[PDB]
């Protein structure tokens, strides 16, 4: 099954860095726009610049993975730039990572959005399953927010988050798709608790025997036993007894019809989050998921 992904090399005269969005280990990442020349099109992008000409290797590997996927709930690569420090041009996710998003707005997300995020993340995970790719670091941090109604997974297939890993990944370093549903169970617990740290007071070493013997995360207050039951089903030690992503899409999109039936958030009906208005820094030709 040939890979056949298309790796686009981009001209840096085609994109402009607007503001810095981060800096540190991996490198400085910029919010910017890409103008495919002769196309009369401006694309809001994120440009990940390598820390130094030595840290390139980590970038080109990331470019290999991102180019090899295509799903509405997986992050999209547009191209790379082979400068002195190579540049990684990815779709701009203006609202950041879902972890920071649920913490900042905790008092304005209703049940419709929580359950819709679970079904969307499960969709992307089901896609990475169909492609036989294992994420190995599924967390609330590695889920980026395009709009409050559209989220996409990121940082897939590249490699310690001990509190997110399944037991076979702990003791035996075994990473499969059923080890990913365990991480999926933790992230749902992350969202249902509005960005809480799993096993807050516990050190990393004690976790293995805590799970091996039989303890798990507690029940989120807003969570009914229905949504909490599938969270614990994700945390079985027997990977084959854990549910499948295909089933998690089904179960969640079901609760996504009567959301007040499965998540008790006081004031749920009064809550809401913004819509994609024409906010920018001028820009009358903007797109992103519509450029093909």
Residue numbers in the entry: 698 to 746, 750 to 859, 876 to 997, 999 to 1009
Paper text:
The only discernible differences between the wild type TKD and ΔL747-E749 are a shortening of strand β3 (from its C-terminal end) and loss of the first turn of helix αC. These changes result from deletion of the three residues (L747, R748, and E749: orange in Fig. 3d) from the beginning of the β3/αC loop. The predicted salt bridge between E762 in αC and K745 in strand β3, required to stabilize ATP interactions of the latter in the active TKD, is precisely maintained in ΔL747-E749. The ΔL747-E749 TKD structure also shows that a 3-residue deletion from the β3/αC loop can be tolerated without major disruption. Interestingly, parallel HDX-MS analysis of the less active ΔL747-E749 TKD variant showed that it does not show the enhanced exchange seen for other exon 19 deletion variants. Our ΔL747-E749 crystal structure shows how such a 3-residue deletion can be tolerated without major disruption (consistent with HDX-MS studies of this variant showing a rigid wild type-like ATP-binding site).
